[PDB]
């Protein structure tokens, strides 16, 4: 009934969409934590102090970690910012981040209030 719960439902709906087949062509790099060692990215954790990805956001939502929409949004945007920080701006993953963030921002803006 409460507004914070309603706003978190909206957040959970967004999260579901971001993880859906509809956006999978560009969302997939953000599905799981960056495995720096496996990708040979030995500077990743020197550059990115707070890694974030959609499975972590999903775990946090499932664990009732997010107390409000703003906290949820902060993690999703952190995930995109990390991508923009680490990768040169002309890399394919940055194009995919921008597209997925477009999905996120436009639906997030329809927050019930
Ligand atoms: C989330 C994130 O920033 N990353 C990411 C995360 C998980 C999986 C892949 C990636 N990609 C790689 C990648 C994406 C898309 C298309 C091709 C490639 C390619 O291999 O050239 C890059 C980057 C890595 C930080 C460099």
Ordered by where they begin, the domains of the chain are 1-113 (1.20.920.10)
Q: DSSP alpha helices (H): ranges in the chain?
A: 3-18, 24-27, 36-39, 44-47, 54-62, 69-86, 92-108
The Cα–Cα gap between 32 and 111 comes to 26
Residue 76 and residue 57 in contact, taking contact as beta carbons nearer than 8 Å: yes
Instruction: State the sign of the Cα–Cα–Cα–Cα dihedral 47, 57, 26, 35.
Output: positive
Among candidates 40, 48, 32, which has minimal Cα distance to 84?
48
Q: Is 71 in the pocket of ligand 1 (CB under 6 A)?
A: no
Which method resolved this structure?
Answer: X-ray
Question: b/e string for 95-105 if b means 16 or more Cβ within 10 A?
Answer: ebbeebbebbe
Q: Is 80 in the pocket of ligand 1 (CB under 6 A)?
A: no
For residue 109, report the distance from its CA to the centre of ligand 1, in Å: 27
Q: Whose CA is nearest to atom 3 of ligand 1?
A: 83
Resolution of this PDB entry, in A?
A: 1.8
Among candidates 4, 19, 26, which has minimal Cα distance to 99?
26
10, two tokens:
């909206």
């Amino acid at each position: 009934m409460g507004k914070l719960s309603e706003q978190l439902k909206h957040c959970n709906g967004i999260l579901k969409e971001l993880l859906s087949k509809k956006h999978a062509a560009y969302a997939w790099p953000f599905y799981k934590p960056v495995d720096a060692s496996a990708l040979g990215l030995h500077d990743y954790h020197d550059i990115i102090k707070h890694p974030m990805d959609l499975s972590t956001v999903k775990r946090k939502m499932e664990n009732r970690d997010y107390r409000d929409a703003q906290e949820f949004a902060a993690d999703v945007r952190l995930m995109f910012s990390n991508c923009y920080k680490y990768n040169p701006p002309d890399h394919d993953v940055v194009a995919m981040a921008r597209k997925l963030q477009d999905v996120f921002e436009f639906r997030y803006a329809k927050m019930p209030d």
